[PDB]
Nucleic acid binder design. Structure first.
Ligand SMILES: [Zn+2]
Ligand SMILES: [Zn+2]
Lengths: 126, 131
DNA sequence: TGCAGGCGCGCCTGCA
DNA sequence: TGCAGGCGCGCCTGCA
DNA sequence: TGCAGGCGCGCCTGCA
DNA sequence: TGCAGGCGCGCCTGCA
């Protein structure tokens, strides 16, 4: 679609503070996943082919569930579903776990699955 | 390839799967709108690429026609074109035209009330909004 | 050469 | 007086 | 009673 | 071995 001149000019475009923050959040996750054998590999498979079923990609759970990245807090399944699937995701009230997920946020286990393809988008209850 | 600007190859790979929000998608539409205008003028696209490639070197005016209210519409959104393109390539948090002043180098600054308005982001400086 | 659809500038109203 | 947004006629392209 | 944000102690790395 | 600074989870308050 896009012409080669437009792509060239877009490379000079400045990313806003939310885009800069999302890079910080991705880096935070990579430091965690690099420590687990196969984790970075499993996530990349999930992201590359959305139509094919993938395994859980989990991180440790905090007491309130929230994760802090560069002075901002959020729920990690919301954080990474915003990054790779729905940038306009409102809250956790808009997400539901698929049957394949063994560590979904809400299951109250030691680890929480952050694989964006283990959750589906729903309507927030009235 | 810097100290602070550096992203690791793993982060770079994962970031390629990142979805851009509705403002980023809009900014691509705005850039495309400008390229259809500049491709019609001899040397215009070239001067724009020059301006953005080397910010330290002086560039010439890169102008587009001016509308009656000054506003430009791109994909159902309106704004002032010098604000629009200064947000794209220089300051994403730019509030309004009140935060902008033209440099003496600019022959066609917004507010000069001329047929054409300069959209070269390096022909404007960021200032404090008057109270 | 007739349709058919998409979108922006110039118009309009509605606030404060 | 200034902004801010909404919508249509006149423009445009894309077919056959 | 759920969010939301602010900040410090305990952790960590990077020097010499 | 010592310092020096950076940042996050667990704490805290402030609303409705
Ligand atoms: Zn899962
Ligand atoms: Zn100029």
């Amino acid at each position: 679609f896009t012409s080669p001149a437009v792509k060239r000019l877009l490379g000079w475009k400045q990313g806003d503070e939310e885009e800069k923050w999302a890079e910080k959040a991705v880096d935070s996750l990579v430091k965690k996943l690099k420590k687990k054998k196969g984790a970075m590999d499993e996530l990349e498979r999930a992201l590359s082919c959305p139509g094919q079923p993938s395994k859980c990609v989990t991180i440790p759970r905090s007491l309130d569930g929230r994760l802090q990245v560069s002075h901002r807090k959020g729920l990690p399944h919301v954080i990474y579903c915003r990054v790779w699937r729905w940038p306009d995701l409102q809250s956790h009230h808009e997400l539901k776990p698929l049957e394949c997920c063994e560590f979904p946020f809400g299951s109250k286990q030691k680890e929480v699955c952050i694989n964006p393809y283990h959750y589906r988008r729903v309507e927030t209850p009235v």
